Design a protein around this ligand. Structure first.
Ligand SMILES: COc1ccc2c(c1)CN(C(=O)CCN1CCC(Cc3ccccc3)CC1)CCS2
Ligand SMILES: COc1ccc2c(c1)CN(C(=O)CCN1CCC(Cc3ccccc3)CC1)CCS2
Lengths: 318, 318
């Protein structure tokens, strides 16, 4: 097992040259979207940034506002994501959720549960460095009750690190996840919260196994996906995430594409945020648990230029 | 994988209660092995340094000098490896294979072939500081031929990023490895040094795949494990470590205990060094590739107090 994405460094890259294709593309005419497109998706994020630099030094123009005036719709909204520094992208998306795209647990839940401790720590740091306010306080401020609580637990980045596991605390803990299952996770939130937030990854993987031999069931079985409140969804995100991050995101991506209308906000966040970290893994995983390819899914459930960009990001292999 | 070791931090660590315990353990009273033994292998390494230091504030004795003057043979060499700082254990054993050892090409192969880039980067500089000379320049003076050359390449820590895996590039590598295979690795030479030492890992595992069906058989079968001088052992070891590190090391453990005698020195090096990184993982790949339990072979083949300490290091299970 080796984590990896779909966007690699362009060899032969020249800041100053790409700055010209782009300027020239959006020069006076309407717009060569097809050029903006193929280029920005066949560069990496650090290379995008240096084009952003070449643009200014050459032209006196801000690449980011130029793009943002000739592009619209789901197209714009993707391009704008690709130009965003990847150190920064998640802290950004959190703010949007904490401040103005709506009522926003799908994001808080999904970023917080799926980002490892190295990441939550960095996101927190940078959330405050960029945005002036601190991640934790914005979260407290716009959330509630036991959900708020566990986001706060996850957000500390303070899991017991990995060594030889206590089949004795495994037996207690699996036991207590059983009782809180039977009871619709509506009693002793107090208790399960730490089990899922402060325990380790392969404590919890052990635990989820001993869970099966208490109850005959996977822990996932306790928690339905349409209806549920906030908390249940956080639990089940934690759960799937402990088992496998690529796999959780592959899932999040299928359910972003099922249903009337559909979910471009998600498509975009996952695609872009993972483009240089694990996207290949998510893709091969998607072929694995859902048996049409990520590529194929997208080509059916997207249109026009946005569609094209997507697939280019996606690549093609598995 | 989640890579875990078998040694953890003792909760409620008392730096000097433990220092006392080592005093009356080895004082008067020439020695008392089983509290020495059990203490050191329930405390993590960095805690053993704290016990080493509170020993000096408290008593005016250098803990380590004391630990080794009351103890003999293999057990002694174990305690002396346990109280040797993580950062430093590797570079010390490189050195003691290089400085003065005889002709120890076995230890070089092992450490450089199993260590990741970031572990080699820390070795090189902590090596460089601790013994005034650079790890490379030493490696160079006592070795020669392509064995030297290949080591210098691995010694670089700069091997391609796991990325877009280029189908065309694979096949040319695999045929080049087919080419040099039939010629028993005795010639062509200089291109496989670049295939092994620089290709990206998710790349080199696909070449390992693509090769077999060119050749009939795995790359490994081209090389005769025991009837094979330095280079071919290195090469072999690199191939192995590319598929899985815990599995190289599991093979090296098995070959240290299987047969006539015991390679005790080797057994100490692996058990100790990897005890806080992947020892559980070496234990698990051990049982799956050899059908016995590491624990129960260290038993079958080692003796006395050395044994109980090893089995404590080895950890409780599976
Ligand atoms: C304390 O340990 C922790 C604490 C929390 C978490 C993990 C490890 C990771 N995890 C795992 O399943 C194990 C390891 N896994 C996580 C993703 C990471 C890959 C990755 C790289 C860069 C950016 C994002 C993801 C490494 C492999 C799930 C819960 S989040
Ligand atoms: C260019 O890369 C390299 C170059 C050389 C080598 C490795 C990685 C390690 N390796 C692999 O197959 C990569 C898998 N690997 C396991 C070790 C390490 C585990 C790990 C994870 C997180 C933090 C510390 C250690 C990194 C992932 C075997 C050959 S030596």
């Amino acid at each position: 097992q080796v984590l990896r994405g779909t966007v690699t460094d362009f060899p032969g890259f020249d800041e100053r040259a790409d700055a010209e294709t782009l300027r020239k593309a959006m020069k006076g005419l309407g717009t060569d979207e097809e050029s903006i497109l193929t280029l920005l998706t066949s560069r990496s994020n650090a290379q995008r940034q240096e084009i952003s630099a070449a643009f200014k030094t050459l032209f006196g123009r801000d690449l980011l506002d130029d793009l943002k005036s000739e592009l619209t719709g789901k197209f714009e909204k993707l391009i704008v994501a690709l130009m965003k520094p990847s150190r920064l992208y998640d802290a950004y998306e959190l703010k949007h959720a904490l401040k103005g795209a709506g009522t926003n647990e799908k994001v808080l839940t999904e970023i917080i549960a799926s980002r490892t401790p190295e990441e939550l720590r960095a996101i927190k740091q940078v959330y405050e460095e960029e945005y002036g306010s601190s991640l934790e306080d914005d979260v407290v401020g716009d959330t509630s009750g036991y959900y708020q609580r566990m986001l706060v637990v996850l957000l500390q980045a303070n899991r017991d690190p990995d060594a030889g596991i206590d089949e004795a605390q495994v037996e207690q803990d699996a036991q207590a996840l059983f009782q809180a299952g039977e009871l619709k996770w509506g009693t002793d939130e107090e208790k399960f919260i730490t089990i899922f937030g402060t325990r380790s990854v392969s404590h919890l993987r052990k635990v989820f196994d001993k869970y099966m031999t208490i109850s005959g069931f996977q822990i996932e079985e306790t928690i339905d996906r349409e209806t549920s409140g906030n908390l249940e969804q956080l639990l089940l995100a934690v759960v799937k995430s402990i088992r496998s991050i690529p796999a959780y995101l592959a899932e999040t991506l299928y359910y972003a594409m099922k249903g009337a209308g559909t979910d471009d906000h998600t498509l975009i966040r996952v695609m872009v945020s993972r483009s240089e970290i694990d996207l290949f893994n998510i893709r091969k995983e998607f072929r694995k648990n859902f048996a049409t390819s990520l590529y194929s899914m997208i080509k059916g459930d997207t249109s026009g230029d946005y569609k094209k960009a997507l697939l280019l990001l996606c690549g093609e292999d598995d």
